[PDB]
Amino acid sequence: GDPVAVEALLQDVFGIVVDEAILKGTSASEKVCEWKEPEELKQLLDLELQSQGESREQILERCRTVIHYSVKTGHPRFFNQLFSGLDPHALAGRIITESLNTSQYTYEIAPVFVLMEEEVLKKLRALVGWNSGDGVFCPGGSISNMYAMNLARFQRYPDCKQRGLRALPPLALFTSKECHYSITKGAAFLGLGTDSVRVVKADERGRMIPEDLERQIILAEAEGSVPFLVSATSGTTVLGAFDPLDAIADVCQRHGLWFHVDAAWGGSVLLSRTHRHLLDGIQRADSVAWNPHKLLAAGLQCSALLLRDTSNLLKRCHGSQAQQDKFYDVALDTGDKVVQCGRRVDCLKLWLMWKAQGGQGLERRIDQAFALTRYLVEEIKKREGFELVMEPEFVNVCFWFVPPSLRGKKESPDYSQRLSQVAPVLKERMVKKGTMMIGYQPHGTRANFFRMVVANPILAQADIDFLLGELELLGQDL
Amino acid sequence: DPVAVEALLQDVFGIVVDEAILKGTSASEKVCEWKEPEELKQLLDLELQSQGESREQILERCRTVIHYSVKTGHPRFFNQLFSGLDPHALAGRIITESLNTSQYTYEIAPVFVLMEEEVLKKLRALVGWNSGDGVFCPGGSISNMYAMNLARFQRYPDCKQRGLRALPPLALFTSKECHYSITKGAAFLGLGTDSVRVVKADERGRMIPEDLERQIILAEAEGSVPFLVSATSGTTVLGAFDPLDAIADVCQRHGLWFHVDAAWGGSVLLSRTHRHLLDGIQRADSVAWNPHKLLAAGLQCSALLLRDTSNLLKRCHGSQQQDKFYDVALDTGDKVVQCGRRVDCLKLWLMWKAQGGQGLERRIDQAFALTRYLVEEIKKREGFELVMEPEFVNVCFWFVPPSLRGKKESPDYSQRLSQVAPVLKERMVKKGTMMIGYQPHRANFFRMVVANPILAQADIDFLLGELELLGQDL
Ligand code: NA
Ligand code: NA
């Protein structure tokens, strides 16, 4: 409780965070990762909790250690996930949130943030194209899609809330083959079962095929299942595709189906007049999942769920059966909207950055990410040994690195099997060297290829010249 | 510009220290700065615009957001089950937000992939298990939804693929003092609220094993298949603790999943004195435990522990070679249904390292002690009436105003008293001297929570003296 000791502690800890985590964490001169084999890091960390406390110095050193051996996700050469970058205003928002440590649950304990969330959700709905609606923030995009499924099930068969799924006919939902696994996880968690997820084929560019969607819908109807929801993707996690929302909307409307748009990754594109055409027709959706923590670098878990409904379907669905004595408009309380009880404050980090950058500052960051995606594509097409998997529609640049030993050997019967062995070796070498982290995955018959993500707001051409030169160095003997 | 970033955050942290941490823990300051919703909207000027704002305007927005927010760490904040500001946990939280990674793979979160297991390993130890599984979740409501789902999958693994229509009607059982997340989770998981069979609670708010087993037998007679029993070791209102060793016996006789919702009261396991309240918890299949509530770790410290050592957690929430260059068993992505997951272990681990097991024991024991002092002063003071003897740190009590003292036999005494707490709540919130919760159950009564680590007897003398002041004309 001693205030002077507390301030001195937090100020000392903040100095280590600033120097070692923020400044040194975003410097290209430092490493992205200080690799240690698990057991060696176990010993280095000395994690075992004990009965006796430790001195101030031993804790501050545990901070320096935790920072040092952690990956620097805000590094200009961190391309391993869909998120990248460390916005200082967002960080300022994050710190204020953790210090106030409240629950986004009632106006009584979170008055500022209960209103802030309403405004932010109102702006997001505007960028979607709605002048009215409902919505909530959720802990991750996976939960935003489970809400959408559940809301569709309840909107069509409200008895499900009480009698359960055994009182309903078999239900069928539809999503692209390029979806995030959160649809199949949510379907089983919601009791529908993985079989209830009918996969729709994607075209050459990774976009759902509206002709096959209805073909699936009609077949599902013929098997006894009842179509109720369609999930399009506006920014797949691998290729960065954008499903045709206006063509899928037509299909949903022709069958009176819930139209949900998983825009967790690509929904942030709606802030740029230049590239927002990629989500044309999204205003015809019933629900939209949108994670500004990915592209705008707001920090996890910035995950929103927007709804076009204006009848409190959200409260009637996730509400309970239990005030009439409180001294304020209880419409501000959002407890009946979610199935959670306590909920973090996830709007401040986004709102504060948005206040500092302005709508313009965030547009340029999106435009600046698309611009650098062109530069990366330029260098891949100009450089030998780098082969683009496909033309990128987003900031996801998928590409192989063909080492010298395989260039020209495409007609070899085992060309695929050996080329698939290249990225795993290049990934291991870059992590242990600590120079960069790039993701890679197989995609069906396609061999292990990289997946760059041009999203870090401090990225520069020099970083793309390095990672491309770095791969050439690390794969010269392959 | 590195210097601009450093100078920006350093200036922002100065505002956080003064207004949020120091002034937030000062008893001379207010707990809440009440503003009518419409006024606060205009005051805050939340509307987002095309043009950004200057550094000066941002720093001013920080102080304003802090000023009008509630001070959950104030010595006179008793509105929720959480209260207090552990500085070590706060340090961990800031380190967490700055490194901004996902508790998903050892590749991107090597330090925390190990840290979390050790913490979860210590929690399983305090439960009484030398082995098991577990993960952190975003709130205890999700910890109970996972537990429900794990039981459904463990008994009927075909459910994951074929759904609930491929299964017989399922029935779960819980006390009338359960968290409402049970009825929500049951509906969210597709079982339906009717699948939740309510069991009667005794005079102390505790589940009655005689009624539990009676319901189970009725469920079997109606065609349903009992599969799970959800006990509570620290209800949200009264602070009850179900008899875990008696319910375990019933679960044992019917081969049912025994889950213990210890989100609130699980922290008692750190005190040798008071851990007898959870005897039999080592006989559970699963246990939900939130260190953010009592220990002041900060939301969302909510764990889900398992006695299972057969990777039931991955087989249930997983997704269905890759060639990665390290033991992929370290990755915990298949354990949860989320994809990216926050790091919630550092704040607890750092505090536990600084306080030691003894320092955290000291806090729990001192919370029970201060809870007794509150009960002492309530029984000695006129106008304060205890609802029932508290077994935890939840002290439920009425305040009978002077106009109702001695009039207990009036036919409308109860109705008149139920109108007292709502007015005392409004007057304390608009005055800003303290925030105490109250709930309906006979008549609206208060629910103190002796959890703030910096609480003192002077604070208990104030809230009792303050209530008398706010209700002298009622
Ligand atoms: Na090329
Ligand atoms: Na009394």
XYZ file of N, CA, C and O in Angstrom, chain A residues 10-11 22 36 38 41 46-48 50-54 62-63 69 71 73 80 86 88 94 98 100-101 107-109 111 113 119 139 142 150 153 161-162 164-166 168 180 185 188-195 300-301 318 320-323 325-327 332 335 338-342 344 351 354-356 358-360 427-428 437 440 442 448, chain B residues 9-10 21 34-35 37 45-50 52-53 61-62 68-70 72 79 82 93 95 97-100 106-108 110 114 118 138 141 145 149 152 160-161 163-165 167 169 179-180 184 187-194 298-300 317 322-325 330 333 336 338-340 342 349 353-354 356-358 425-426 435 438 444:
664
model
N 6.831 0.812 -10.129
C 6.258 0.878 -11.468
C 7.112 1.725 -12.400
O 7.265 1.392 -13.580
N 7.684 2.819 -11.896
C 8.551 3.630 -12.743
C 9.782 2.839 -13.164
O 10.209 2.906 -14.324
N 9.983 -1.913 -25.900
C 9.413 -1.049 -26.928
C 10.502 -0.555 -27.870
O 10.424 -0.758 -29.087
N 15.861 -20.512 -27.574
C 16.370 -21.418 -26.554
C 15.522 -22.681 -26.592
O 14.292 -22.598 -26.660
N 13.417 -25.665 -25.192
C 12.536 -25.535 -24.018
C 13.199 -25.738 -22.664
O 13.087 -24.872 -21.789
N 15.483 -22.946 -21.688
C 14.737 -21.758 -21.280
C 14.054 -21.992 -19.935
O 13.967 -21.075 -19.110
N 13.678 -20.123 -14.334
C 13.496 -20.457 -12.921
C 12.073 -20.110 -12.469
O 11.833 -19.214 -11.657
N 11.130 -20.872 -13.019
C 9.714 -20.561 -12.900
C 9.053 -21.088 -11.635
O 7.972 -20.603 -11.279
N 9.656 -22.058 -10.954
C 8.970 -22.741 -9.862
C 8.584 -21.765 -8.759
O 9.433 -21.052 -8.214
N 7.409 -20.582 -5.079
C 7.898 -21.003 -3.777
C 7.195 -20.214 -2.686
O 6.433 -19.278 -2.948
N 7.447 -20.641 -1.447
C 6.776 -20.054 -0.295
C 7.308 -18.670 0.048
O 6.563 -17.828 0.567
N 8.600 -18.446 -0.149
C 9.191 -17.148 0.138
C 9.154 -16.209 -1.060
O 9.290 -16.629 -2.213
N 8.861 -14.946 -0.773
C 8.964 -13.908 -1.765
C 10.400 -13.571 -2.070
O 11.336 -14.051 -1.434
N 10.570 -12.684 -3.043
C 11.877 -12.265 -3.524
C 12.015 -10.756 -3.372
O 11.049 -10.044 -3.084
N 13.696 -10.438 -13.290
C 12.763 -11.363 -13.923
C 11.971 -10.668 -15.024
O 11.594 -11.309 -16.010
N 11.734 -9.358 -14.893
C 11.133 -8.609 -15.992
C 12.088 -8.536 -17.177
O 11.715 -8.853 -18.313
N 13.937 -12.879 -23.560
C 13.748 -14.169 -24.212
C 12.404 -14.294 -24.921
O 12.165 -15.309 -25.583
N 9.655 -13.289 -27.911
C 9.741 -12.846 -29.295
C 9.328 -11.381 -29.371
O 8.458 -10.916 -28.623
N 7.373 -9.289 -31.345
C 6.362 -9.284 -32.397
C 6.222 -7.923 -33.066
O 5.644 -7.839 -34.155
N 5.261 -13.476 -38.793
C 4.852 -14.846 -38.504
C 3.351 -15.013 -38.300
O 2.851 -16.136 -38.429
N 3.470 -2.376 -33.145
C 3.273 -1.959 -31.753
C 2.961 -0.464 -31.812
O 3.856 0.375 -31.686
N 2.063 3.005 -30.514
C 2.250 3.553 -29.160
C 0.967 4.067 -28.537
O 0.776 3.919 -27.324
N -3.833 0.409 -23.863
C -3.757 -0.872 -23.168
C -3.345 -0.691 -21.711
O -3.901 -1.337 -20.814
N -5.460 -1.713 -18.212
C -5.008 -2.626 -17.167
C -4.914 -1.934 -15.813
O -5.096 -2.582 -14.775
N -6.901 0.628 -14.684
C -8.253 0.820 -14.170
C -8.953 -0.496 -13.860
O -9.947 -0.491 -13.125
N -8.487 -1.601 -14.447
C -8.942 -2.953 -14.142
C -10.410 -3.024 -13.753
O -10.741 -3.263 -12.586
N -22.998 -0.041 -16.624
C -22.661 1.375 -16.596
C -22.182 1.814 -15.221
O -21.423 2.784 -15.121
N -22.590 1.105 -14.171
C -22.270 1.521 -12.813
C -20.773 1.464 -12.541
O -20.228 2.347 -11.869
N -20.089 0.432 -13.046
C -18.660 0.272 -12.788
C -17.789 0.647 -13.983
O -16.565 0.787 -13.821
N -18.566 3.408 -16.607
C -19.385 4.425 -17.284
C -18.747 4.976 -18.549
O -19.414 5.103 -19.580
N -16.368 3.624 -20.442
C -16.145 2.621 -21.474
C -17.443 2.020 -21.996
O -17.477 1.536 -23.134
N -20.054 4.131 -29.113
C -19.634 5.003 -30.205
C -18.789 4.233 -31.211
O -19.021 4.308 -32.423
N -14.009 -11.783 -26.960
C -12.594 -12.173 -26.752
C -12.056 -13.075 -27.864
O -11.903 -14.290 -27.729
N -12.860 -15.977 -32.960
C -13.506 -17.281 -32.881
C -14.824 -17.189 -32.125
O -15.804 -17.853 -32.482
N -24.912 -18.950 -33.253
C -25.941 -19.092 -32.230
C -27.086 -18.115 -32.461
O -28.258 -18.467 -32.285
N -29.210 -19.540 -35.267
C -30.009 -20.654 -34.771
C -31.177 -20.158 -33.930
O -32.300 -20.659 -34.058
N -33.245 -22.254 -27.313
C -32.654 -21.719 -26.091
C -33.033 -22.560 -24.881
O -32.213 -22.768 -23.979
N -34.265 -23.068 -24.853
C -34.792 -23.803 -23.711
C -34.799 -25.312 -23.924
O -34.361 -26.061 -23.047
N -33.264 -27.094 -26.401
C -32.038 -27.652 -26.928
C -32.163 -28.082 -28.371
O -33.198 -27.923 -29.025
N -31.072 -28.666 -28.871
C -30.985 -29.026 -30.280
C -31.789 -30.274 -30.628
O -32.139 -30.458 -31.799
N -32.096 -31.130 -29.652
C -32.917 -32.304 -29.932
C -34.355 -31.945 -30.277
O -35.085 -32.804 -30.783
N -34.969 -29.613 -32.494
C -34.842 -29.007 -33.807
C -34.409 -30.036 -34.839
O -33.800 -31.057 -34.500
N -11.280 -20.014 -41.617
C -10.532 -20.317 -40.404
C -11.231 -21.465 -39.678
O -12.453 -21.624 -39.754
N -14.746 -25.468 -35.179
C -14.690 -25.544 -33.722
C -15.990 -25.036 -33.113
O -16.565 -25.676 -32.225
N -19.052 -27.523 -33.409
C -19.094 -28.628 -32.456
C -19.364 -28.119 -31.045
O -20.138 -28.726 -30.298
N -18.748 -26.990 -30.675
C -18.965 -26.401 -29.355
C -20.425 -26.004 -29.166
O -20.966 -26.111 -28.058
N -21.077 -25.539 -30.231
C -22.498 -25.214 -30.200
C -23.392 -26.438 -30.356
O -24.612 -26.282 -30.484
N -22.821 -27.639 -30.375
C -23.605 -28.852 -30.414
C -24.108 -29.250 -31.780
O -24.758 -30.298 -31.902
N -23.845 -28.443 -32.808
C -24.296 -28.784 -34.151
C -23.500 -29.962 -34.707
O -24.051 -30.822 -35.404
N -22.218 -30.045 -34.371
C -21.340 -31.083 -34.899
C -20.584 -30.622 -36.129
O -21.062 -29.818 -36.927
N -19.364 -31.144 -36.285
C -18.557 -30.752 -37.438
C -19.241 -31.117 -38.749
O -19.079 -30.408 -39.750
N -20.003 -32.213 -38.768
C -20.691 -32.608 -39.991
C -21.688 -31.551 -40.446
O -21.988 -31.455 -41.642
N -4.332 -7.631 -29.186
C -5.353 -8.624 -28.871
C -5.933 -8.326 -27.490
O -5.201 -7.905 -26.592
N -7.235 -8.555 -27.286
C -8.186 -9.097 -28.244
C -9.197 -8.063 -28.741
O -10.332 -8.032 -28.260
N -28.854 -14.101 -25.701
C -27.855 -14.402 -24.687
C -28.269 -13.920 -23.305
O -27.482 -14.022 -22.359
N -30.677 -13.604 -19.735
C -31.114 -14.512 -18.686
C -32.532 -14.152 -18.250
O -33.166 -13.244 -18.794
N -33.018 -14.871 -17.239
C -34.404 -14.766 -16.804
C -34.392 -14.233 -15.374
O -34.924 -14.867 -14.457
N -33.759 -13.079 -15.177
C -33.633 -12.477 -13.854
C -33.509 -10.958 -13.966
O -33.631 -10.390 -15.051
N -32.406 -4.275 -13.751
C -33.111 -4.294 -12.474
C -34.281 -3.320 -12.525
O -34.345 -2.462 -13.408
N -35.058 -1.507 -9.696
C -34.797 -0.541 -8.637
C -33.588 0.350 -8.911
O -33.315 1.256 -8.115
N -32.842 0.113 -9.990
C -31.638 0.893 -10.261
C -31.968 2.300 -10.754
O -33.039 2.559 -11.311
N -31.028 3.218 -10.505
C -31.204 4.651 -10.706
C -30.634 5.141 -12.035
O -30.258 6.313 -12.149
N -28.122 0.598 -20.777
C -26.681 0.735 -20.950
C -25.945 -0.538 -20.551
O -24.863 -0.815 -21.079
N -24.866 -6.853 -20.093
C -24.702 -8.200 -19.575
C -25.548 -9.218 -20.314
O -25.124 -10.359 -20.522
N -24.059 -10.751 -23.998
C -23.035 -11.774 -24.121
C -23.389 -12.961 -23.237
O -24.227 -12.874 -22.334
N -22.741 -14.097 -23.517
C -22.846 -15.249 -22.628
C -21.803 -15.186 -21.523
O -21.904 -15.934 -20.537
N -20.815 -14.305 -21.648
C -19.858 -14.101 -20.582
C -20.525 -13.368 -19.425
O -21.682 -12.946 -19.499
N -19.784 -13.247 -18.328
C -20.177 -12.398 -17.212
C -19.252 -11.191 -17.136
O -19.647 -10.080 -17.500
N -18.008 -11.388 -16.707
C -17.016 -10.334 -16.739
C -16.336 -10.266 -18.096
O -16.012 -11.288 -18.699
N -13.407 -7.897 -20.436
C -12.355 -6.899 -20.439
C -12.838 -5.648 -21.175
O -13.880 -5.641 -21.832
N -9.894 3.108 -29.642
C -10.449 4.457 -29.682
C -9.363 5.514 -29.538
O -9.378 6.527 -30.246
N -7.261 5.721 -32.690
C -8.108 6.368 -33.686
C -8.217 7.863 -33.429
O -8.264 8.655 -34.376
N -8.219 8.275 -32.161
C -8.266 9.701 -31.864
C -6.957 10.384 -32.233
O -6.967 11.539 -32.673
N -5.827 9.691 -32.081
C -4.543 10.305 -32.397
C -4.260 10.270 -33.895
O -3.810 11.270 -34.467
N -6.611 9.651 -36.369
C -7.712 10.107 -37.191
C -8.024 9.098 -38.276
O -7.185 8.249 -38.592
N -9.224 9.168 -38.851
C -9.554 8.270 -39.943
C -8.533 8.312 -41.059
O -8.274 7.297 -41.712
N -7.924 9.477 -41.280
C -6.933 9.611 -42.341
C -5.673 8.822 -42.011
O -5.139 8.098 -42.859
N 12.876 -21.858 -42.118
C 12.249 -21.361 -40.898
C 13.115 -21.655 -39.678
O 13.312 -20.787 -38.821
N 13.639 -22.879 -39.583
C 14.486 -23.241 -38.450
C 15.743 -22.382 -38.404
O 16.194 -21.984 -37.323
N 11.115 -13.868 -38.708
C 10.165 -14.968 -38.559
C 9.094 -14.794 -39.629
O 8.341 -13.815 -39.604
N 4.853 -20.237 -42.791
C 4.721 -21.117 -43.943
C 3.754 -22.243 -43.608
O 3.637 -22.652 -42.450
N 1.514 -25.782 -45.827
C 1.011 -26.391 -47.062
C -0.450 -26.022 -47.281
O -1.172 -25.643 -46.356
N 4.924 -26.745 -49.104
C 5.165 -25.753 -48.061
C 5.644 -24.445 -48.684
O 6.732 -24.403 -49.270
N 4.952 7.826 -24.158
C 4.499 6.866 -23.157
C 4.914 7.285 -21.753
O 4.138 7.135 -20.804
N 6.113 7.851 -21.606
C 6.554 8.296 -20.288
C 5.619 9.368 -19.747
O 5.295 9.378 -18.553
N -3.442 5.117 -10.209
C -2.846 4.239 -9.212
C -2.868 4.935 -7.860
O -3.492 4.449 -6.910
N -19.798 10.248 -10.478
C -21.034 9.938 -11.179
C -21.407 11.042 -12.159
O -21.362 12.232 -11.834
N -21.819 10.630 -13.357
C -22.318 11.528 -14.388
C -23.475 10.842 -15.098
O -23.384 9.656 -15.430
N -25.654 9.494 -18.001
C -25.118 9.019 -19.287
C -24.988 10.091 -20.357
O -23.929 10.227 -20.978
N -16.689 13.553 -25.645
C -16.489 13.850 -27.064
C -15.849 12.651 -27.772
O -14.711 12.687 -28.244
N -16.641 11.580 -27.842
C -16.142 10.287 -28.287
C -16.129 10.141 -29.802
O -15.452 9.245 -30.318
N -16.865 10.982 -30.521
C -17.046 10.792 -31.955
C -15.707 10.816 -32.683
O -14.919 11.756 -32.531
N -15.437 9.750 -33.436
C -14.198 9.621 -34.196
C -14.273 10.378 -35.516
O -15.329 10.440 -36.152
N -13.143 10.944 -35.932
C -13.115 11.868 -37.051
C -11.994 11.525 -38.021
O -11.173 10.636 -37.784
N -11.985 12.256 -39.139
C -11.003 12.021 -40.188
C -9.639 12.587 -39.819
O -8.612 12.008 -40.190
N -6.643 13.506 -37.161
C -6.085 13.126 -35.883
C -5.972 14.337 -34.971
O -6.346 15.460 -35.311
N -5.491 14.081 -33.756
C -5.330 15.101 -32.729
C -3.883 15.164 -32.257
O -3.095 14.240 -32.476
N -7.140 13.606 -23.017
C -8.120 12.531 -23.080
C -7.777 11.388 -22.135
O -8.682 10.693 -21.659
N -6.491 11.166 -21.854
C -6.129 10.138 -20.882
C -6.589 10.514 -19.478
O -7.233 9.714 -18.790
N -13.160 10.013 -14.742
C -14.561 9.618 -14.680
C -14.775 8.115 -14.598
O -15.927 7.674 -14.569
N -13.719 7.319 -14.616
C -13.855 5.884 -14.415
C -13.852 5.550 -12.924
O -13.355 6.309 -12.090
N -14.444 4.400 -12.598
C -14.451 3.934 -11.219
C -13.043 3.504 -10.820
O -12.253 3.023 -11.645
N -11.440 0.885 -9.068
C -11.678 -0.448 -8.525
C -10.691 -0.818 -7.429
O -10.942 -1.769 -6.682
N -18.053 -3.267 -4.542
C -19.178 -3.511 -5.435
C -19.111 -4.848 -6.154
O -20.157 -5.371 -6.555
N -14.105 -8.683 -7.137
C -12.723 -8.245 -7.285
C -12.576 -6.836 -6.721
O -13.491 -6.014 -6.826
N 0.977 -7.043 -16.072
C 0.015 -6.676 -17.106
C 0.638 -5.749 -18.144
O 0.418 -5.919 -19.349
N 3.876 -5.386 -18.885
C 4.824 -6.174 -19.664
C 4.076 -7.029 -20.677
O 4.520 -7.203 -21.819
N 1.117 -6.356 -22.148
C 0.592 -5.549 -23.243
C 1.698 -5.037 -24.159
O 1.468 -4.858 -25.361
N 2.901 -4.808 -23.627
C 3.974 -4.268 -24.457
C 4.541 -5.329 -25.394
O 4.825 -5.045 -26.564
N 4.713 -6.559 -24.903
C 5.237 -7.625 -25.750
C 4.197 -8.145 -26.735
O 4.572 -8.765 -27.735
N 2.909 -7.918 -26.465
C 1.819 -8.226 -27.388
C 2.048 -9.480 -28.221
O 2.322 -9.387 -29.421
N 4.839 -22.114 -28.798
C 6.158 -21.822 -28.247
C 6.971 -20.973 -29.217
O 7.890 -20.266 -28.791
N 6.643 -21.032 -30.512
C 7.410 -20.313 -31.525
C 7.317 -18.805 -31.336
O 8.316 -18.092 -31.498
N 6.128 -18.296 -30.997
C 5.936 -16.858 -30.834
C 5.848 -16.432 -29.372
O 5.916 -15.223 -29.088
N 7.661 -18.160 -26.357
C 8.415 -19.227 -25.674
C 8.410 -19.086 -24.163
O 8.211 -20.079 -23.453
N 5.972 -21.830 -21.336
C 6.463 -22.552 -20.167
C 5.879 -21.991 -18.874
O 5.454 -22.752 -17.997
N 3.720 -24.047 -15.666
C 4.166 -24.089 -14.284
C 3.098 -23.535 -13.366
O 2.724 -24.182 -12.386
N -10.943 -16.804 -21.007
C -11.395 -15.404 -20.826
C -12.696 -15.308 -20.033
O -13.791 -15.102 -20.556
N -17.166 -17.786 -16.908
C -18.297 -18.307 -17.668
C -17.812 -19.237 -18.771
O -18.459 -20.245 -19.077
N -18.231 -23.288 -19.398
C -18.678 -23.811 -20.686
C -17.715 -24.867 -21.212
O -18.144 -25.899 -21.741
N -18.679 -28.822 -21.851
C -18.351 -29.449 -23.126
C -17.420 -30.640 -22.948
O -17.590 -31.673 -23.606
N -19.504 -33.553 -21.808
C -20.299 -34.072 -22.917
C -19.430 -34.870 -23.882
O -19.815 -35.963 -24.313
N -18.959 -34.428 -30.983
C -18.160 -33.404 -31.649
C -18.488 -33.327 -33.133
O -18.483 -32.240 -33.724
N -18.789 -34.470 -33.746
C -19.014 -34.587 -35.180
C -20.492 -34.654 -35.546
O -20.924 -33.966 -36.476
N -23.207 -34.056 -33.434
C -24.072 -33.117 -32.744
C -24.939 -33.781 -31.692
O -24.849 -34.981 -31.423
N -25.806 -32.967 -31.080
C -26.629 -33.436 -29.970
C -27.821 -34.281 -30.405
O -28.360 -35.027 -29.579
N -28.262 -34.170 -31.663
C -29.359 -35.015 -32.125
C -28.939 -36.477 -32.237
O -29.801 -37.356 -32.346
N -27.343 -37.896 -29.798
C -27.193 -38.254 -28.401
C -28.550 -38.273 -27.717
O -29.494 -37.613 -28.167
N -31.206 -37.341 -24.567
C -31.328 -36.125 -23.751
C -30.345 -36.162 -22.589
O -30.237 -37.163 -21.879
N -23.695 -19.864 -10.510
C -23.468 -18.730 -11.394
C -24.405 -18.854 -12.589
O -24.670 -19.958 -13.073
N -24.929 -17.722 -13.060
C -25.883 -17.785 -14.162
C -25.253 -18.280 -15.455
O -25.985 -18.622 -16.392
N -26.700 -20.077 -19.116
C -26.300 -19.526 -20.405
C -25.462 -20.533 -21.184
O -25.744 -20.819 -22.354
N -27.430 -23.325 -22.768
C -28.151 -22.923 -23.970
C -27.189 -22.660 -25.121
O -27.471 -23.021 -26.269
N -26.047 -22.034 -24.830
C -25.059 -21.753 -25.867
C -24.494 -23.037 -26.463
O -24.216 -23.101 -27.667
N -24.313 -24.069 -25.640
C -23.825 -25.361 -26.109
C -24.924 -26.221 -26.734
O -24.668 -27.386 -27.057
N -26.131 -25.677 -26.899
C -27.227 -26.351 -27.565
C -28.038 -27.306 -26.718
O -29.034 -27.851 -27.213
N -27.664 -27.511 -25.454
C -28.407 -28.429 -24.598
C -29.774 -27.876 -24.214
O -30.734 -28.642 -24.069
N -29.880 -26.567 -24.045
C -31.115 -25.945 -23.597
C -31.142 -25.746 -22.096
O -30.579 -26.519 -21.322
N -31.812 -24.670 -21.674
C -31.898 -24.379 -20.247
C -32.607 -25.497 -19.490
O -32.273 -25.768 -18.330
N -33.574 -26.167 -20.127
C -34.265 -27.262 -19.457
C -33.310 -28.381 -19.062
O -33.611 -29.144 -18.136
N -6.096 -9.297 -11.627
C -6.553 -8.531 -12.767
C -7.204 -9.394 -13.830
O -6.704 -10.475 -14.146
N -8.315 -8.930 -14.395
C -9.059 -9.724 -15.367
C -8.209 -9.934 -16.616
O -7.498 -9.018 -17.033
N -8.302 -11.107 -17.266
C -9.151 -12.249 -16.928
C -8.317 -13.437 -16.460
O -8.071 -14.370 -17.226
N -11.121 -29.883 -27.996
C -11.114 -28.562 -28.614
C -10.123 -28.448 -29.761
O -9.971 -27.357 -30.323
N 3.556 -31.721 -40.233
C 3.784 -30.299 -40.459
C 5.261 -29.962 -40.622
O 5.592 -29.022 -41.352
N 6.150 -30.702 -39.958
C 7.607 -30.605 -40.069
C 8.214 -29.523 -39.181
O 9.386 -29.161 -39.387
N 7.478 -28.996 -38.204
C 8.027 -27.962 -37.334
C 9.229 -28.520 -36.576
O 9.311 -29.720 -36.297
N 10.166 -27.636 -36.220
C 11.470 -28.063 -35.727
C 11.556 -28.102 -34.204
O 12.640 -27.913 -33.641
N 4.265 -28.695 -27.139
C 4.304 -27.510 -26.289
C 3.236 -26.499 -26.685
O 2.788 -25.710 -25.845
N -2.615 -24.641 -28.798
C -3.703 -24.144 -29.623
C -4.893 -25.084 -29.671
O -6.045 -24.640 -29.712
N -7.864 -25.008 -26.551
C -8.970 -24.066 -26.474
C -9.662 -23.995 -27.830
O -9.125 -24.423 -28.858
N -10.546 -20.970 -28.944
C -10.056 -19.729 -29.516
C -8.911 -20.028 -30.484
O -8.469 -21.170 -30.634
N -8.442 -18.986 -31.169
C -7.245 -19.082 -31.998
C -6.087 -18.339 -31.341
O -5.157 -18.970 -30.835
N -6.114 -17.008 -31.348
C -5.166 -16.222 -30.580
C -5.687 -16.030 -29.165
O -6.870 -15.769 -28.955
N -4.724 -14.392 -25.162
C -3.888 -13.484 -24.399
C -3.001 -14.243 -23.415
O -3.271 -15.386 -23.037
N 2.111 -14.869 -11.961
C 3.414 -15.452 -11.661
C 4.343 -14.433 -11.025
O 5.018 -14.732 -10.033
N 5.803 -14.643 -7.348
C 7.244 -14.662 -7.126
C 7.668 -13.586 -6.135
O 8.634 -13.777 -5.388
N 6.984 -12.439 -6.138
C 7.357 -11.340 -5.255
C 6.800 -11.527 -3.849
O 7.489 -11.244 -2.862
N 5.604 -14.536 -2.638
C 5.789 -15.883 -2.152
C 4.468 -16.474 -1.686
O 3.472 -15.794 -1.458
N 4.457 -17.800 -1.582
C 3.247 -18.464 -1.101
C 2.752 -17.924 0.232
O 1.542 -17.885 0.492
N 3.674 -17.503 1.095
C 3.280 -16.971 2.395
C 2.598 -15.617 2.253
O 1.540 -15.382 2.847
N -27.748 2.950 -2.211
C -26.822 2.785 -3.325
C -26.754 4.053 -4.168
O -25.665 4.514 -4.530
N -27.912 4.637 -4.484
C -27.931 5.846 -5.301
C -27.211 6.997 -4.610
O -26.511 7.781 -5.262
N -18.936 2.229 -2.836
C -19.855 1.481 -3.689
C -19.978 0.082 -3.101
O -18.999 -0.671 -3.070
N -25.752 -4.800 -3.756
C -26.955 -5.303 -3.107
C -27.684 -6.158 -4.131
O -27.527 -5.973 -5.342
N -34.233 -6.940 -0.523
C -32.956 -6.445 -1.029
C -31.985 -6.153 0.108
O -32.217 -5.253 0.921
